Write a protein that binds this DNA or RNA. Structure first.
Ligand SMILES: [Mg+2]
Lengths: 52, 73, 88, 56, 342, 235, 134, 268, 88
RNA sequence: GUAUGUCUAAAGUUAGCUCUUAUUUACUAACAAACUAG
RNA sequence: GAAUCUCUUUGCCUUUUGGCUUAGAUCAAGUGUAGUAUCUGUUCUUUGUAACA
């Protein structure tokens, strides 16, 4: 029971139609951003140790 | 709706029923008139260094990526 | 089987199944729920419990009661109440 | 006069109108009213949970 | 009387054939191979016309390229290498039938006159004419000297898929999408015998090389025809096989049948028995729809089998010379009564 | 005046509904003809109004505890990638920005950066004359189904029927008059033009069968001649 | 109250004799030029063959309508409603010998189609020719 | 009267369409059971063409209720059309770069084919590092950040501040960022909607500098979701080049931020 | 069901319609078969086929009459009815 | 402004509502302040 | 007990989307006169009886 061929780009006979007929992650980002936060903490621990 | 897809082809029965006109074409001039027959220390300051096939899809291929990195700069 | 493959009659079958479970039981209950209030009953029996309650809510007067019971058995309770309200 | 008509019919569109700012602030006020309702209901839920936990 | 026919089938037994397994994959083309042709004398090479317009001449013993024949501009649909001429007739859908002089590897003759795209060639093996037919539902015979459409063949309704020529009348055994395998009289220009036993488009007719018969293939029914009168010889088993693209007939009565579903089905041609059903593995990055076996041929000896599939590959299949009648007996011989195909 | 220079106006309800009645007819990619309806807006802003407010497939509803606790983890993970967080949530980007800003906790003449996401101003019966004109032109253009070649063919076939009934009107006057003049035949456009009254249009009488024929051809010819006399007297 | 159903409902709402024989001859000329024009460009719309042949049934000339159904069978003989309507066409004009030639053709063409057989069996049922049905 | 037209270079597209379309319709009519074609034979192929546009837009061709083998055969035939289309794009590209006779319309067609292929490779290249990866390991990222902290503290680099409400050189940075924008629009005549709209934004910024600076600093604070970027892919006959047509409201504050970041990087 | 079964059921329906209602010569040379067909049976079949055609005609007009989601002209509401029937 | 399309008796075929009236807006014009077409 | 008429549901689609490419491509910078179309403003209305042919 093939559907009745509604598409977005070409409406040939100018039909309007029901609107619905027209129209997760790897872990590695958690591996990056956490590590970057860790490095940022080390940076803030190092530089503030030198600002005393 | 003046432009349409093809339903069936123009059949050669309709071309076999027409009587021909003799229009000696530029390519049906006699040529190749013989049929051939067969027989029968300085790098330790940095942070990186040595001290420290085929797939069927054409768009996803290796050559196409080499192509697009060659021709979009 | 009866509960599954079988309105009054169906209800009776369900009841029988429940009884059997009470007397594997959990599995039976789950099956009953799938087949079909039933969800609420299952939740009550259980009383994971929270999850069951939530499920019951999704598939409401008795639901609220069930939620309350779950809460009893504070923040969580409040959240549940809020959810119920939203649903309503 | 031409530039004044331009600065009228342009800047009626690409400015937040006082009625448009009123409607947007009314929608934000209804959102804050629903948030205040949920916050007061959460406070009543916490007080009711404490009362019924010490009561039941 | 039907019970007598079924009992007389179950009385007889099929012939054993050696099981086919794959031996060589050729992955050269930038498009789908649409027909495969092999030289009927030398077996030094076979040419596979493909959708990237470039016919490629591959090598049987080594699997190498040797040349590429790229005179067309459209999809090369059929390739037919001559038996007694050093020619190579290449139907494409350029509306052009081009002759390739194999002593030169050049286009020499261009047969104009087709009304639409052409699908198949059929070199009449004991005369100097070729049989080209296609979408325009009419077979044009072509004298190879004068490039004239000599005899038009009127009577097919839809586009014509596969045309085969025999040295004795029916000299054109053609078949179209109107489910008719027409047997043609080349002299009279009339269909001597119209064979209407198929249901859908007969995409495949293959000549038996050692007996005067033609196998024709619709979806889930492949049927062998005796060309002496136009009689059905055997309705093959072919249950739930799929859309059959091409057939090919061994000298040793092994009938290939490539399906669009990726399945192969080698048939005992005498008995109609299905004995082996392969699953053509797709390439490592193909879609599942590209398992289809578009075209095939045998070796002149028949011990090889060449298939062009739609995954831009060419596969070679050979028999198991180490299997016996008791080792790999093939599928079972049991004719089905629910089908009337027996 | 028509200053149509800047177009970023605040989305009213009537433009919102005309875009909803436009994407149904035209579609998700044909936006110049959607912006032809809306006399105030662009095609980029219409496409943004679509993909951020008027597309029903992405969710505007309130988020669960799970979605808040994973959106905080995403905004730590993917820091300022709000279109990426929008793709992961399958949710509008500015809505997820507003939800993140609510989880952590613009004057009149200022040009609104982000008007095409928030809301739509309701029009409680106060349809402006600009709104009446633009809405009437929009419902004029949504009726434009046939092309102008089909429109001129309906026009030409109407002219054929009008000329034909005028010709029959003139002939009926001259026939009540008594002047016996027959109808024109249409001109042979091409030299082998077929006139479909003289002969059978293509004689394709059925192939002869085993039953005898003429006894009902006589009935056919008799009934046809009685119909000819009846058209001669009634029509 | 400017919702899209109102706009589309109102754009739906916005979108909406023979005296003498020679006049009927001009009517047939106009109408046959029309239908042969829309059958010359497309010879595969079988409903068009059906309704032009049914038009020429309404014009009561039967050799024309028989020629039109036979050319329609020449195009696609496998289309069963074409057969059934041409059979019922020659039966409405009370011509059963023509219809028996027709349905013998419809049987010898398509034997493995049930409805041609069953309709011929119906015609021989209500004609009460039992030995024929045998 | 039987003049039949051979397929020259005007009819590769149209006759290849008729070729592939007849092939696909014969495949469906072979596959489908007992259906006599009157109207449906015309319409299934629309799905085919829908799928081809779904292949050109790289949208997943998901149609609800389509059978499995019909979806399979439409996917493999649009992959065949894709293979011929991509190989024709390569053949046209190395036909232009050889310097031979290439049609103007074939150059514009080759622009369109190569930008569809470029955005398709771009979407796949975003989508892989969406699905797996990303390619940078955490240890690489920490060493990058560590050597940047080490450099920026070895140079005693004070960070660039946010531009204040009363920044000293502010209107000069603004008139530089707007002379950067009017340098495009001093000589040209043909102006579309977006160019005319942003030229009106520059003229309105000249009419009000202080409202413009407050608009820009408000957008630098609060706005984190931005209007999209059109690309247009202008042609250089060795290599196409991406041309990012950014939104008209965005380029004023981005040119301001470019001027401010370069001036505050060169001061520090 | 299918065209074979539907032809079978229409044959059974037409035999039910007859149930509610209820020689052969040849020449020598031509060989054409003259069958005696009674005029009451001939025009009874004719009136029956015209009554079936008019009954189907009026029932099809009854289906044409009904109009009750989003459409511009008549063909469009038919196509939207088709999409509503595809949605199951 | 082209393409292109269409019309053109000299010749005789035998018996709430209905309304007037003005402002505004939208699309069009080789109409105006020697030349421009697919 | 035999059957007709009217409804309800199901099944058949019944005026039921009939190609392609670079989404095929690009989008007012006036006025006056006129034409067409629409809104808004304005005024009016609610038979017996007798004789003769
Ligand atoms: Mg032109």
């Amino acid at each position: 029971k093939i559907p009745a061929a509604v598409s977005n780009w070409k409406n040939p006979n100018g039909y309007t139609v029901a609107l619905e007929r027209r129209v997760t992650i790897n872990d590695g980002f958690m591996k990056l951003s956490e590590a970057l936060e860790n490095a940022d903490k080390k940076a803030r621990q190092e530089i503030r140790s030198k600002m005393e | 709706t003046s432009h349409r897809p093809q339903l069936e082809a123009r059949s050669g029965a309709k071309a076999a029923a027409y009587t021909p006109t003799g229009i000696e074409h530029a390519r049906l001039l006699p040529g190749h008139t013989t049929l051939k027959y067969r027989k029968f220390s300085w790098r330790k300051g940095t942070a990186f260094g040595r001290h420290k096939g085929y797939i069927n899809d054409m768009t996803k291929s290796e050559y196409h990526q080499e192509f697009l990195h060659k021709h979009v700069r | 089987r009866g509960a599954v493959i079988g309105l009054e009659s169906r209800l009776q079958l369900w009841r029988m199944c429940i009884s059997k479970a009470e007397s594997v039981t959990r599995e039976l209950y789950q099956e009953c729920i799938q087949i079909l209030e039933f969800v609420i009953k299952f939740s009550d029996f259980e009383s994971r419990a929270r999850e069951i309650l939530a499920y019951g809510a999704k598939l409401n007067t008795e639901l609220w009661d069930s939620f309350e019971i779950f809460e009893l058995k504070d923040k969580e309770t409040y959240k549940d109440m809020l959810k119920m309200k939203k649903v309503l | 006069k031409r530039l004044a008509k331009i600065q009228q019919e342009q800047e009626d569109d690409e400015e937040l109108e006082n009625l448009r700012k009123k409607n947007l602030e009314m929608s934000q006020r209804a959102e804050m009213i629903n948030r205040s309702k949920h916050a007061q209901q959460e406070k009543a839920v916490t007080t009711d949970d404490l009362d019924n936990l010490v009561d039941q | 009387l039907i019970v007598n026919r079924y009992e007389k089938l179950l009385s007889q037994r099929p012939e054993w054939h050696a099981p086919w397994k794959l031996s060589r994959v050729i992955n050269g083309h930038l498009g789908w191979v649409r027909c495969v042709a092999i030289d009927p004398v030398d077996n030094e090479w076979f040419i596979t016309g493909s959708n990237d317009t470039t016919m490629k001449v591959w090598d049987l013993a080594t699997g190498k390229l040797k040349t590429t024949l790229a005179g067309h501009v459209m999809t090369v649909r059929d390739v037919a290498v001559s038996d007694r001429h050093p020619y190579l007739f290449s139907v494409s859908e350029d509306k052009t039938v081009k002759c390739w002089d194999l002593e030169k590897n050049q286009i020499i003759r261009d047969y104009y006159g087709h009304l639409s795209g052409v699908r198949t060639v059929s070199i009449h093996p004991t005369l100097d004419l070729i049989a080209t037919a296609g979408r325009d539902s009419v077979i044009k015979l072509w004298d190879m000297r004068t490039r004239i459409p000599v005899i038009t063949l009127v009577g097919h309704k839809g586009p014509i898929n596969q045309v085969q020529c025999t040295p004795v009348d029916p000299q054109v055994v053609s078949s179209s999408t109107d489910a008719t395998v027409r047997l043609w009289d080349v002299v009279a220009g009339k269909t001597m015998k119209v064979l209407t036993h198929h249901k859908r488009s007969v995409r495949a007719t293959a000549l038996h090389p050692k007996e005067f018969s033609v196998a024709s293939a619709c979806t889930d029914d492949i049927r062998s025809w005796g060309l002496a009168e136009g009689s059905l010889l055997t309705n093959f088993e072919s249950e739930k096989t799929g859309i059959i693209n091409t057939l090919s007939i061994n000298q040793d009565d092994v009938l290939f049948a490539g399906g669009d579903n990726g399945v192969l089905s080698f048939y005992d041609y005498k008995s109609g028995h299905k004995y082996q059903s392969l699953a053509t593995r797709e390439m490592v990055g193909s879609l599942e729809g590209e398992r289809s076996v578009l075209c095939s041929t045998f070796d002149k000896t028949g011990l090889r089998l060449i298939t062009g599939e739609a995954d831009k590959s060419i596969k070679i299949w050979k028999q198991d010379e180490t299997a016996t009648k008791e080792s790999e007996p093939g599928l079972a011989w049991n004719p089905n009564l629910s089908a009337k195909r027996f | 005046p028509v200053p149509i220079y800047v177009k970023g106006g605040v989305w009213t309800n009537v433009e919102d509904q005309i875009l909803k009645a436009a994407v149904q007819k035209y579609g998700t990619h044909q936006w110049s003809k959607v912006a032809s309806l809306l006399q105030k807006k662009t095609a980029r802003q219409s496409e943004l109004r679509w993909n951020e407010y008027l597309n029903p497939k992405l969710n505007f509803t309130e988020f669960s505890k799970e979605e808040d606790a994973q959106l905080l983890d995403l905004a730590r993970e993917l820091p300022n990638q709000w279109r990426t967080i929008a793709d992961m949530m399958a949710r509008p980007a500015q809505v997820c920005v507003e939800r993140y800003n609510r989880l952590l906790e613009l004057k009149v003449g200022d040009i609104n950066p982000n008007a095409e996401t928030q809301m739509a101003r309701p029009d409680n019966g106060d349809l402006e004359d600009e709104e009446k004109e633009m809405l009437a032109e929009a419902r004029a253009r949504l009726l434009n189904t046939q092309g102008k070649k089909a429109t001129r063919k309906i026009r030409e076939r109407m002219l054929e029927e009008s000329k034909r009934i005028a010709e029959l009107q003139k002939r009926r006057e001259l026939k009540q008059a008594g002047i016996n003049v027959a109808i024109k035949k249409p001109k042979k456009k091409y030299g082998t033009d077929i006139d479909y009254n003289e002969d059978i249009v293509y004689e394709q009488a059925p192939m002869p069968g085993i039953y005898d024929t003429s006894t009902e051809d006589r009935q056919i010819k008799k009934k046809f001649e009685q119909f000819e006399r009846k058209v001669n007297r009634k029509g | 109250h400017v919702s899209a159903e109102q706009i589309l409902r109102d754009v739906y709402k916005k979108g909406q004799d023979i005296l003498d024989l020679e006049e009927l001859r001009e009517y047939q000329r106009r109408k046959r030029t029309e239908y042969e024009g829309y059958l010359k460009r497309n010879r595969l719309d079988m409903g068009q063959w059906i309704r032009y042949a049914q038009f020429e049934i309404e014009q009561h000339d039967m050799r024309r309508a028989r020629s039109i159904f036979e050319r329609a069978l020449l195009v696609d003989s496998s289309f069963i409603p074409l057969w059934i309507r041409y059979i019922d066409a020659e039966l409405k004009v009370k011509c059963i010998n023509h219809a028996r030639n027709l349905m013998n053709r419809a049987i010898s063409t398509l034997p493995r189609v049930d409805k041609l057989w069953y309709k011929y069996l119906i015609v021989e049922e209500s004609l009460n020719n039992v030995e024929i049905v045998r | 009267n039987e003049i039949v037209k051979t397929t020259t270079k005007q009819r590769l597209d149209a006759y290849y369409d008729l070729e592939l379309r007849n092939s696909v319709m014969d495949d469906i009519l072979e596959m489908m059971p007992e259906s006599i074609r009157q109207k449906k034979a015309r319409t299934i192929l629309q799905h085919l063409s829908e799928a081809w546009r779904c292949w050109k837009a790289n949208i997943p061709w998901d149609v609800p209720g389509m059978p499995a083998p019909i979806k399979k055969i439409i996917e493999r035939y649009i992959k065949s059309k894709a293979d011929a289309w991509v190989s024709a794009a390569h053949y046209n590209r190395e036909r232009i770069k050889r310097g031979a006779h290439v049609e103007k319309t074939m150059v514009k067609k080759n622009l369109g084919r190569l930008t569809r292929l470029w955005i398709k490779n771009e979407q796949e290249r975003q989508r892989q590092i969406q699905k797996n990866g990303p390619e940078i390991t955490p240890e690489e990222a920490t060493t990058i950040f560590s050597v940047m902290v080490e450099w920026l503290e070895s140079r005693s680099f004070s960070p660039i501040p946010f531009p204040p409400l009363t920044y000293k050189n502010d209107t000069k940075i603004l008139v530089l960022a707007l002379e950067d924008l009017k340098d495009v629009y001093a000589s040209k005549v043909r102006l579309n909607a977006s160019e005319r709209e942003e030229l009106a934004l520059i003229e309105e910024a000249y009419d009000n500098p202080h409202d413009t600076l407050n608009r820009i600093k408000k957008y630098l604070l609060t706005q984190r979701v931005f209007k999209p970027v059109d690309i247009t892919m202008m042609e250089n006959y060795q290599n196409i080049s991406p041309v990012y047509s950014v939104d008209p409201l965005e380029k004023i504050t981005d040119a301001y931020l470019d001027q401010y970041l370069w001036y505050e990087a060169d001061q520090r | 069901i299918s065209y074979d079964q539907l032809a079978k059921l229409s044959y059974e329906k037409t035999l039910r319609n007859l149930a509610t209602q209820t020689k052969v010569q040849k020449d020598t040379k031509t060989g054409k078969i003259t069958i005696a067909d009674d005029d009451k049976l001939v025009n009874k079949l004719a009136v029956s086929l015209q009554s079936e055609s008019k009954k189907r005609y009026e029932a099809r007009k009854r289906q044409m009459q009904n109009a009750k989601e989003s459409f511009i002209n008549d063909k469009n509401k038919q196509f939207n009815e088709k999409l509503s029937r595809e949605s199951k």
